């Protein structure tokens, strides 16, 4: 049961909303929905810009220097990876998070047609990687996308809950809907 325990979104979303001006700016620059950015902030850090997880995920959107941080650096045309200090900067963190969502949308998840299925695919990919998601459909990226396109949002969630190896995957979707209802 990925909905258990329940997650009350009120506090973490209202805290995350204090970052909205940055989220709207970053979202407009990268073509990313600021409500999704706000949801991710609420879910990942509860709006605490200094959060540091066990696995060294840092800041408002819990970006990890060696994984998503480096992916965004490559998208900017840079080598290396951000520092912890850089990831604690709220503006830098949220803009990098927005950039990462754009990278997912325009790279591995390109061709998803339904914008609600795409929303769910984004959070699941954000949480455990686009590869882990797509491989539950096919080792071939295009066949994977074609299979995703055969599903609606509620069927996508069912698939993820049954077939995704990470329990966090379907729970992210549940939390997303909890977060959205609180905005």
């Amino acid at each position: 049961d990925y909905t258990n325990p329940p997650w009350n979104a009120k506090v973490p979303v209202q805290r995350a909303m204090q970052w909205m001006p940055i989220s709207q700016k970053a979202g407009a620059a990268w073509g990313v929905d600021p409500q999704l950015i706000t949801a991710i902030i609420a879910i990942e850090s509860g709006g605490n810009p200094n959060a540091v997880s066990k696995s060294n995920a840092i800041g408002l959107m819990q970006l990890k220097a060696s994984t998503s941080g480096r992916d965004v650096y490559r998208r900017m045309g840079w080598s290396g990876e951000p520092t912890t200090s850089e990831l604690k900067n709220p503006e830098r963190n949220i803009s990098m998070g927005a950039a990462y969502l754009n990278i997912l949308e325009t790279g591995p998840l390109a061709g998803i047609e339904d914008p609600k299925v795409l929303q769910y695919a984004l959070v699941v990919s954000y949480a455990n990687g686009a590869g882990a998601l797509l491989r539950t459909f096919s080792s071939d990226r295009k066949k994977a996308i074609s299979k995703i396109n055969d599903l609606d949002a509620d069927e996508f969630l069912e698939h993820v809950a049954r077939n995704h190896p990470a329990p966090q995957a379907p729970r992210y979707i549940y939390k997303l809907e909890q977060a959205l209802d609180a905005m």
Side-chain angles (χ1 to χ4, degrees):
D1 183 0
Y2 60 86
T3 75
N4 185 70
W7 183 69
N8 195 327
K10 173 167 152 162
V11 173
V13 165
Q14 292 193 18
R15 296 189 174 160
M17 288 287 303
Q18 302 190 355
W19 302 101
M20 189 58 72
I22 301 182
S23 302
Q24 289 179 125
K25 176 170 163 69
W30 286 97
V32 169
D33 172 6
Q35 297 200 151
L36 175 58
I37 290 162
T38 297
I40 303 308
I41 292 160
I43 292 170
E44 293 288 351
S45 76
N48 170 3
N50 296 311
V52 179
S53 77
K54 254 49 158 81
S55 31
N56 214 216
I58 312 296
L60 286 175
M61 298 189 70
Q62 289 290 280
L63 294 156
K64 203 176 142 42
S66 48
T67 60
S68 52
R70 152 170 277 111
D71 285 347
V72 168
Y73 268 33
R74 158 164 49 253
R75 173 62 181 78
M76 286 167 283
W78 299 356
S79 68
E81 47 182 53
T83 63
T84 278
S85 208
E86 184 173 335
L87 289 174
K88 288 194 184 188
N89 182 272
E91 173 167 279
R92 253 49 178 208
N93 189 273
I94 291 165
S95 65
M96 180 165 317
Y100 186 57
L101 290 168
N102 180 263
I103 291 165
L104 295 170
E105 180 171 355
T106 65
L109 306 186
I112 296 177
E113 282 159 12
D114 181 330
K116 192 75 187 164
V117 169
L118 175 57
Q119 194 190 60
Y120 284 5
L122 281 159
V123 296
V124 168
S125 300
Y126 192 96
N128 292 285
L133 171 56
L134 292 168
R135 288 192 291 279
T136 69
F137 293 94
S138 170
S139 251
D140 190 271
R141 204 196 63 86
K142 284 176 280 162
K143 295 200 194 166
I145 295 298
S146 181
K147 287 157 198 293
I148 290 162
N149 282 327
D150 290 326
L151 302 179
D152 69 23
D154 304 309
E155 292 171 331
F156 184 84
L157 168 59
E158 197 172 26
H159 170 96
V160 169
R162 286 172 196 186
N163 305 122
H164 200 292
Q168 150 178 220
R171 186 162 178 77
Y172 214 115
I173 293 178
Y174 152 78
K175 284 176 162 176
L176 168 62
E177 289 296 353
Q178 298 295 282
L180 289 174
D181 189 56
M183 307 185 174

